[PDB]
Design a protein around this ligand. Structure first.
Ligand SMILES: Nc1ncnc2c1ncn2[C@@H]1O[C@H](COP(=O)(O)OP(=O)(O)O)[C@@H](O)[C@H]1O
Ligand SMILES: [Zn+2]
Ligand SMILES: [Zn+2]
Ligand SMILES: [Zn+2]
Lengths: 590, 45
RNA sequence: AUGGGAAAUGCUACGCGGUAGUAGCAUGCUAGGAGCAG
RNA sequence: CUGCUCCUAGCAUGCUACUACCGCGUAGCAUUUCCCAU
């Protein structure tokens, strides 16, 4: 086990102790790192400790070679030499240690807390390998943090599906959703065995919680549900492959006279062909995933695999491909858990298909010819190089929109993050511009595009359809809990329930609630087509119902609302609590 | 009682307390300094 | 057309206890010096 | 050599009062944050 360094990339085999990921360092690089930072532990073919059992010094600052092992001064043998070299650290290979000085950024990477936007923006500015290491250590930090989550010291259970949840004091009791993974542990003085992969969501009403596990007993009193963390694997492939310009087509099979909306985009498709790859930077709603299926129609011959960030986007892509492309050449890869539903009509995880679909975390390690990825804003730089490593094709396509909301990055609790610095690809998109751009929101008519282009977007956007005259508003406030218990505006639900009858075609209007509790309680009361923004990302609906609960940095986000309204087709009705935000748009009040 | 762990910890607590008082950032920070002073006195006692 | 609302950061008041420092009280012993009586 | 007394010093103990900080406990007042995917 020997490798290159990182700052200087010289051949060496030293690693740091305090650095969580334990990376390979040369001699001079390691010496600089341990001089600067407080890291006082170095790993090699053996650990570094005072070999004398009467000492327990692990500091590399002083350690004396006791014949073959390390010693303190109080145990140093007479004929012996300290192993702190002449401005380096003694060890494996010294005669081939090339010099490099950019250690300060690397020291900061192993220093900062990822609570300040300076950390994240600085992370996406260093060397490629440093970027990979920073992403890896950030992921590990997140895993460690979520590991230290609530230990639910419950007391009661309602039914075979429903239970009562209570928690310990001191650690963060995490929220409940199908996304998270929990498991109880039978404390019977012994046999603390897993009770199964237990997911949890809040019940319908009152102090009630619905529980579903891989096994399902009738749970006892003394158990607890602790959130465990999954490991993070290292990576080697670059985040971004280099660009190469061509002259002729790169070996793709066309289809003459297939459609019409994409013959105009044939020039764009050839522009993709003349390079190793290409990207897409444009507003949501306007030929994004739709510029995709027609491009496939241009060269529908090779055996290909695709994917998407979230499940709704890939399911909509599957439906669109079924609508346009033949069915029996496309597939969608499903995960083992599959607790969140998917396109439950198609092939059940058929990796042996010509145009395959999947999710980010369940991608295989096979290859293809071309590929397209969904919503670079929702993704990090880690998963980019992850798919680069597992998948290697001859052409790559990337889609995304800077105005969209980025990945959660919950540890960053200070400041806002500039859209370019969402990932490396977004920075490149905002610096060098797009590869091809489409700007005419096709699903929403002219009034919505006017509102979005006048208020948040640049006054450049246009549409193809005239006003549908289904714009209405509401402003009255309502009351919430105000003491934790994320805001729930029940009077608005009651007024919606009382009113809805007058609105005939709005019975199936897609209800929107980013907050999980409100999202559940709305369906609990009436059963509207409930939905959250996060999960509306890249979707689209004829009738939508948006509901703002209260005012907060979350609910007052410009990007959240503008990505919420880009999903209007023919009809919508939504409510506020904020005055100037109510006045900002250009619709009818009522 | 100079060469004692309580003495050294109290010295570091005083250094942090004077540094943060010179910074004068937060009232809760000053309360943290006072609590550190009070546990340092407790152990030094 | 219904008698089911917390996490607690911050302020104030009271009490307890501990710790330290200060003053006062009583005593118990020790040691020393001195005087009276037989 | 026994008994009585004075004075001084020290110690130690007990008790009382005062001062500071602490945390607790209680009460009152008031705020600050507001949460999302696998
Ligand atoms: N050129 C076009 N002609 C007709 N409809 C289009 C066109 N481009 C996009 N659409 C519509 O847009 C919908 C998909 O949204 P899209 O424009 O791909 O952006 P995104 O999917 O990211 O919001 C499709 O249902 C499609 O009907
Ligand atoms: Zn280190
Ligand atoms: Zn090096
Ligand atoms: Zn030693």
């Amino acid at each position: 086990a020997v490798g290159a360094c990182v700052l200087c990339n010289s051949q060496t085999s030293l690693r740091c102790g305090a650095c969580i990921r334990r990376p390979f360092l040369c001699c001079k690089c390691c010496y600089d790192h341990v001089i600067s930072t407080s890291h006082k532990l170095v790993l090699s073919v053996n650990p570094y400790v005072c070999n004398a059992p009467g000492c327990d010094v692990t500091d590399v600052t002083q350690l004396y070679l006791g014949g073959m092992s390390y010693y303190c001064k109080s145990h140093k043998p007479p004929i012996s030499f300290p192993l702190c070299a002449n401005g380096q650290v003694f060890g494996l290979y010294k005669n081939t240690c090339v010099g490099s000085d950019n250690v300060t950024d690397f020291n900061a990477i192993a220093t900062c807390d990822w609570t300040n936007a300076g950390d994240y923006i600085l992370a996406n500015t260093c060397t490629e390998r440093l970027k990979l290491f920073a992403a890896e250590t950030l992921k590990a930090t997140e895993e460690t943090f979520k590991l230290s989550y609530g230990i639910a010291t419950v007391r009661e259970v309602l039914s075979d599906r429903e239970l009562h949840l209570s928690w310990e004091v001191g650690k963060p009791r995490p929220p409940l959703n199908r996304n998270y993974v929990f498991t109880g542990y039978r404390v019977t003085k012994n046999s603390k065995v897993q009770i199964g992969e237990y997911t949890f969501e809040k019940g319908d009403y009152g102090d009630a919680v619905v529980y579903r596990g891989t096994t399902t007993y009738k749970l006892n009193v003394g158990d607890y549900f602790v959130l465990t963390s999954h490991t993070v694997m290292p990576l080697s492939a670059p985040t971004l492959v280099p660009q190469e310009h061509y002259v002729r087509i790169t070996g793709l099979y066309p289809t003459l006279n297939i459609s019409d909306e994409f013959s105009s985009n044939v020039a764009n498709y050839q522009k993709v062909g003349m390079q190793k790859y290409s990207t897409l930077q444009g507003p949501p709603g306007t030929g994004k995933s739709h510029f995709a299926i027609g491009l496939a129609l241009y060269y529908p011959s090779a055996r290909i695999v695709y994917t998407a960030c979230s499940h709704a986007a890939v399911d909509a892509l599957c439906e669109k491909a079924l609508k346009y492309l033949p069915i029996d050449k496309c597939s969608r890869i499903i995960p083992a858990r599959a607790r969140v539903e998917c396109f439950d009509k198609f092939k059940v995880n058929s990796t042996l298909e010509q145009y395959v679909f999947c999710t980010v975390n369940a991608l295989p390690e096979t290859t293809a010819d071309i590929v397209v990825f969904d919503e670079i804003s929702m993704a990090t730089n880690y998963d980019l190089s992850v798919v680069n490593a597992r998948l290697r094709a001859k052409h790559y396509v990337y889609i995304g929109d800077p105005a969209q909301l980025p990945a959660p990055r919950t540890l960053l609790t200070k400041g806002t993050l500039e859209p370019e610095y969402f990932n490396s690809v977004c920075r490149l998109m905002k610096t060098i511009g797009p590869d091809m751009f489409l700007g005419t929101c096709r699903r929403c008519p002219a009034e919505i595009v006017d509102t979005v282009s006048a208020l948040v977007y640049d006054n450049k956007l246009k549409a193809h359809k005239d006003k549908s005259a289904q714009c209405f508003k509401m402003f009255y406030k309502g009351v919430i809990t105000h003491d934790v218990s994320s805001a729930i505006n029940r009077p608005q639900i009651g007024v919606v329930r009382e009113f809805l009858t007058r609105n005939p075609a709005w019975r199936k209007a897609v209800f929107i609630s980013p907050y999980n509790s409100q999202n559940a309680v709305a369906s609990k009361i009436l059963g509207l087509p409930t939905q959250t923004v996060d999960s509306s990302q890249g979707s689209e609906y004829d009738y939508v119902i948006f509901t703002q609960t209260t005012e907060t940095a979350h609910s007052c986000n410009v990007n959240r609302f503008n990505v919420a309204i880009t999903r209007a087709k023919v009809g919508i009705l939504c409510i506020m609590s904020d005055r100037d935000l109510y006045d900002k748009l250009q619709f009818t009040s009522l | 009682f100079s060469s004692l762990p309580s003495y050294a910890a109290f010295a570091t607590a005083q250094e942090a307390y004077e540094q943060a008082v010179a910074n004068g950032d937060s009232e809760v920070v000053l309360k943290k300094l006072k609590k550190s002073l009070n546990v340092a006195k407790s152990e030094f006692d």
